[PDB]
Amino acid sequence: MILAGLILKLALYAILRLLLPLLCEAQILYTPMIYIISLLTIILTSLATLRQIDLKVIIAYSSISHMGIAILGVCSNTSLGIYGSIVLGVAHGFVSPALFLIVGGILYDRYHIRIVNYYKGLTTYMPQLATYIIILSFANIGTPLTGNFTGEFLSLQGGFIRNPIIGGISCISVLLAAIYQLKLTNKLTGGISSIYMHRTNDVTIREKFIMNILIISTLIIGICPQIMYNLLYWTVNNYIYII
Amino acid sequence: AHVLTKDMIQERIVALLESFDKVNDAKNITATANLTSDLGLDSLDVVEVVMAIEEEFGLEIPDHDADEIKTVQQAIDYVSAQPAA
Amino acid sequence: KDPWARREAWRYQTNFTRANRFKGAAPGFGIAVVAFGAYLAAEK
Amino acid sequence: IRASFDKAEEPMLGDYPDIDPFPAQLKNPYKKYDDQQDRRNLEEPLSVNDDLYDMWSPDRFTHFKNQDALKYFIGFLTIFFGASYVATYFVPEKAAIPREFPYEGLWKESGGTEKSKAFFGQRS
Amino acid sequence: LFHLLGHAFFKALLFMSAGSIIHSILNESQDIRTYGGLLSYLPYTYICITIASLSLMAMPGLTGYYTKDIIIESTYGSYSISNYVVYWIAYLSAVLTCVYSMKILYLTFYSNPNNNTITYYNAHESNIYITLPMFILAIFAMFAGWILKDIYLGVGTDFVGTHILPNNFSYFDTEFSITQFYKLLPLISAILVSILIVVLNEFFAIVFNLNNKYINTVYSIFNQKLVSDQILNHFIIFKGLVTSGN
Amino acid sequence: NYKWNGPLPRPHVSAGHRIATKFLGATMFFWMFLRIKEEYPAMLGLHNFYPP
Amino acid sequence: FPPLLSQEDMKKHKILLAYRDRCAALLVPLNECRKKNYYMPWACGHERHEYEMCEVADFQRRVKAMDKLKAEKIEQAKAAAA
Amino acid sequence: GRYPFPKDVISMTGGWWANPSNWKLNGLFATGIAVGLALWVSTATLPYTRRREGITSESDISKWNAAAGVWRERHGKISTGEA
Amino acid sequence: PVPFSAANKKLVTSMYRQSLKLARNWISNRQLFRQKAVEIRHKFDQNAQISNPRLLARTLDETRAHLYEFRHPDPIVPPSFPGGTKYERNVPPRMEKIMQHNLYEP
Amino acid sequence: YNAISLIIILPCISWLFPLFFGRQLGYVFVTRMTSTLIIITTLITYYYFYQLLGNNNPINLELFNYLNIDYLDINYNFEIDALTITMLLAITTISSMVHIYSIGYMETDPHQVRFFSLLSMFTFWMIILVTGSNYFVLFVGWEFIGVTSYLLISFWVTRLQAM
Ligand SMILES: CCCCCCCCCCCCCCCCCC(=O)OC[C@H](COP(=O)(O)OCCN)OC(=O)CCCCCCCCCCCCCCCCC
Ligand SMILES: CCCCCCCCCCCC(=O)OC[C@H](COP(=O)(O)OCC[N+](C)(C)C)OC(=O)CCCCCCCCCCC
Secondary structure: OHHHHHHHHHHHHHHHHHHOOOOHHHHHOOHHHHHHHHHHHHHHHOOOOOOOOEOHHHHHHHHHHHHHHHHHHHOOOOHHHHHHHHHHHHHHHHHHHHHHHHHHHHHHHHHOOOEHHHOOOOOOOOHHHHHHHHHHHHHHHOOOOOOHHHHHHHHHHHHHHHOHHHHHHHOOHHHHHHHHHHHHHHHHHOOOOOOOOOOEOOOOOHHHHHHHHHHHHHHHHHHOHHHHHHHHOOOOOOOOOOO | OOOOOHHHHHHHHHHHHHHOOOOOOOOOOOOOOEOOOOOOOOOOHHHHHHHHHHHHHOOOOOOOOOOOOOEHHHHHHHHOOOOOO | OOOOOOHHHOOOOOOOOOOOOOOOOOOOHHHHHHHHHHHHHHOO | OOOHHHHOOOOOOOOOOOOOOOOOOOOOOOOOOOEOOOOEOOOOOOOOOHHHOOOOOOOOOOOOOHHHHHHHHHHHHHHHHHHHHHOOOOOOOOOOOOOOOOHHHHOOOOOOOOOOOOOOOOOO | OHHHHHHHHHHHHHHHHHHHHHHOOOOOOOOHHHOOOOOOOOHHHHHHHHHHHHHHOOOOOOHHHHHHHHHHHHHHHOOOHHHHHHHHHHHHHHHHHHHHHHHHHHHHHHOOOOOOOHHHHOOOOOOOOOOHHHHHHHHHHHHHHHHOOOOOOOOOOOOOOOOOOOOOOOHHHHHHOOOHHHHHHHHHHHHHHHHHHHHHHHHHOOOOOOOOHHHHHHHHHHHOOOOOHHHHHHHHHHHHHHHHHO | OOOOOOOOOOOOOOHHHHHHHHHHHHHHHHHHHHHHHHHHHHHHOOOOOOOO | OOOOOOHHHHHHHOOOHHHOOOOHHHHHHHHHHHHHOOOOOOOOOHHHHHHHHHHHHHHHHHHHHHHHHHHHHHHHHHHOOO | OOOOOOOOOOOOOOOOOOOOOOHHHHHHHHHHHHHHHHHHHHHHOOOOEEEOOOOOOHHHHHHHHHHHHHHHHHOOOOOOOOO | OOOOOHHHHHHHHHHHHHHHHHHHOOOOOHHHHHHHHHHHHHHHHHOOOOOOHHHHHHHHHHHHHHHHHOOOOOOOOOOOOOOOOOOOOOOOOOOOOOEOOOOOOO | OOOOHHHHHHHHHHHHHHHHOOOOOOHHHHHHHHHHHHHHHHHHHHHHHHHHHHOOOOEEEEEEEEEEEOOEEEEEEEEOOHHHHHHHHHHHHHHHHHHHHHHHOOOOOOOHHHHHHHHHHHHHHHHHHHHEOOOOHHHHHHHHHHHHHHHHHOOOOOOOOOO
16 A cells, blocks of 8 residues: 555656756657657556456556556646646545555455455445445546546646647557456456355455545545645646746 | 246146147056157157257256156156246 | 147137237227317318 | 467466366356356366456357458448449439528628638628 | 437337336246237237337327438438438338338237247236336327427527538428428338238248248348457457457 | 146236227327328428429 | 518527528518417417428529529530530 | 345345335435435525526627727737638 | 167257257247248158168268258347346345454454 | 526435435335436426526536636536437436336346436436536546446346346
8 A cells, every 4th residue: 555655656756856847958858758658558557457367466557557647747848737647646546555455455354365266246245345346446447526537637638738649549548447447346346256255244344444535535636626726836837848 | 926836837748748649648648657668759759848848838958958857757856946937 | 740739729729810919909090080080070 | 279379378388287278158058067157167277368268258259250250241341331432423413502691601690801701601 | 309309209118118028928038039929918018119119110190200201301402412322321221120110019919929828828017117107108209209399390490509500501401302202202111111021921921931041141140230249359359358468 | 827738818908908008099090190181291292392 | 582681680680600591581580489489389380381481482593593504514515525 | 036135244225125114214314304405405506507698798798809809909910711 | 870879869869959949049930930840850750761870970960060050140048047138137145154354353 | 496406416316315325215215215306307307498498598507616727627517508408308207217117127126226226326427418518527427327337237246248
């Protein structure tokens, strides 16, 4: 949780703080290498998610794909992309450690093995975990009103300003982020309750108390992304070099 | 709804085989009557009987047990094991 | 010619004969021709 | 081993048993497996590259051959757009003129300035 | 927009008539090859689904005449010359629209029975929650196209605020420039083919049950969704999974 | 279900279903006849608006 | 057809872009009569028959035009060969 | 059907066949909260609704077109249709 | 490949089942079906006098391929059976006590 | 009486209350709760259609700001145009008939508290697909009807082919 929610957004902060305001003229020569690398992390690493036997590794590559969307909003030299990458960094840091509570948090405490192939039919004995499977997955894909879509939308828009062909190709990420996440969600959620699996406890009071915090804190940003515009409106301007 | 019993299966299979024409007699039919020997059916007539059994009950069967149901009591004890009607 | 001869009787009996399969195919036609005739004669 | 990707993974395996990959769907359903949902006995060796041969794998039709199926689909796509293109040469002409509009073509109504009259305005 | 409106009242009644004849069988089966004669047993869902089908085939009195045939009309009246092709392209679809609605009205209501006979003993209708919405949607799918034909169709109706380019507006052309033949021809041949399908089903029935090796490859093409489910699955999905494993 | 091999008995529908069928069918063919009568020259294609 | 309106009158009555021609004069009581009722089909049939007939008279001159415009096609096709 | 079900699992939407014995009592609370919510939201959003046409006068729009023409005139901007 | 025996009987009964089933799903109008079934029956009754193994195997795989030509897109499945639409709607959950994982709670 | 917040908020009530109070109310009460609120949504929209035939000016409402940066604002604006009210009387009528039709068709279905929640939900994000007055709310309803189209036809999670 502290890796994927905090250590990753640090370099999103460090590309703002270190690079952009003294490397101003060295970037505009060299942003279309950043667009190459960010696109073929979105195209490649969100496509290797499909073939994964392990269950925590999928949410790992999900973190890679969203952080690859985010740094083509920073490196846009435009005004919507900066704020879009910040709201990606604050909303992915909510939705993603909740998913790590789902994969190695709850399910590894109950059954201690993280292979996907054992895990189907989670609905019939854990209904009020299959809800947290679905609403938290559909929050990761970038359904609106969740704060991930506000960030994905503004960062794809800011990366569409700077170079529109790379933005048009990079827009396919909404599809590619739906594919593996919904494939995982409907393998876990549906089917007959598995053979290998004795029925264990429902999700307990603390593992709901964590989750509802990490869900309301996405939904508030998704209903109003402006609750933190009072902080950021200088740093939307502090990093633009379009003379 | 509608729930079958044992005697319903019984009267359906007896009135089933009384409709069929290559039987020997309409009088020698029992629960324990062999389709092959007592009824005078071929290797291939009993398959058409099984086909009518499965059409008229709804249920379909594989060939793994299509030869298992040699006598009529075995067909009835088969069909009463399936919750489909 | 028919091993299951008396089997497919009820496929063709008086419930499912050629006249009763087309019996109620147009249920309100015989009333609607009368009422439309009355409306045709009463509109003038 | 049937598909070209299953062949391309022979030199990786060293202690893996290398079983024949067969679809989970094309097994019959009437045999009573441990897993009726996925058609799989309890300790049965999974294949090299299993998740293309799972029950949760794609649908994998079995009526046509895929090459033939490609020919029939592109055949319908061709016979539509070829016939609808040849049939534009056999078209009949119209009996009416296109209708007309006043005020020098309503140039002023759909926007417009006197110098800008070319872009806006239809059929004076 | 008018077709979008009246089309809902077609279809919802078609779906919840089909659900009523699926729900009224002990097995709850869905193949049309296994229904048979249900006309005397289920008259209520009969009269509802024939409201539905005569609406769906654009028969003269109902909402379908107002909502479907005038789109076939506007292909002839447009100013682009190439849109006379889409007259026959959209016309063929109306003749084909009759030939399956007669398939679903014949093979589940008029034909010889096909199930076992228990489903003919226990064939009945549903209580009031399945009867009353079919009643109300039948009334709507009969009247609402004539009632609402002066707001969407009409003639000088400033109701929707869509701003047609007047160099592209061809509705005044497609009301009057239609000769008697091109307007008569859909109504007529829709009716006539709708009788031909029932008669060729009932009297002869060998025309539809040939065992041609050639016609049945064609039937197996159009049965399997114009093979394209196979095409999309094997050439895109499966190749996508394989090149994501590479 | 007394006669498996025999002919089938006539169905028993209740009164409300069959009067509802008669009402719906009567309104259908009646409304069809009204709309064919009122629009017969327009719906058929008569009185063409071409000039002589 | 009735007389063509002024420049201001089309802007006042808010007639749609495609409905403004030399036959648009009968429209400005027709839509108002439609608003008086609730766009109902049995009501307000007189003025819509008027607008329809004005437009039929607008259609016949179009047909006579397109009939005329075909003659010199044949005439130039005969004259360009000779 | 009415197959048996395990009564120990606690869902939120009810379970398999949720029909608790005091549903007439709780229906009163549910309709009270639903009517309170519907009336309070319907009265709270009254001043936020406006009427589309006729909310501003024509003279305002004509003088805003005039001010547009002034600002457009000062920068020396041709019409989009002018080539 | 072999004369009168169980191994030939099980084969030809399986093929006769398939030959009636692959015409059941194939046509409507039961009159035509029971006609066609009587002549399919006559095809099996007419050729069942073969006394060599070789021409038996020749007609055998020839009718295996003839039955393989007339395959149908969707066979008629009853809905509660695994091609059908009622298959596994609500499978009743197995009765299981709660297996516990934590000493502390719960 | 706003006749917009009763068009919008009333199926929102019909979704939210079957889930929150599902186990408390039960399936017999949710059959008649979920239906009648869509019934009164439906008879408000016929009445608004009747009024909108009188004059052609819609009512919109304006809510709290979604996000504004440079050159860009996004609000929650819901506006019932003629183009909106056509589709509105389509979907409310069809939905309110289906909520009644699925009382007798589902009378042996176990899980019909979730099912009536899901029917009235699909009604609601259609209700805000149609009447939004920007292309953003048209995206909002466009995605949540896709989310329901997952959650609806995979009602029998036990069945493989539904998933
Ligand atoms: C020119 C006009 C353009 C307009 C469109 C033209 C046609 C395009 C058609 C292809 C696009 C369709 C959308 C792609 C997603 C396909 C998803 C899908 O179909 O999943 C279904 C599959 C299970 O479905 P199934 O088994 O068939 O269900 C049977 C039920 N009885 O579920 C699965 O398990 C599948 C999981 C894999 C999903 C597919 C993975 C590959 C996706 C390909 C995207 C390509 C991206 C390449 C990016 C390159 C950019 C440079
Ligand atoms: C649930 C279905 C929808 C319910 C709709 C109910 C409407 C009730 C009346 C609202 C009045 C109003 O919002 O006023 C708007 C006020 C002030 O904006 P204003 O400038 O004064 O007015 C705007 C009108 N303009 C534009 C014409 C001037 O901003 C707010 O409140 C924003 C508060 C957001 C808090 C953070 C989100 C918390 C969500 C968490 C959920 C888990």
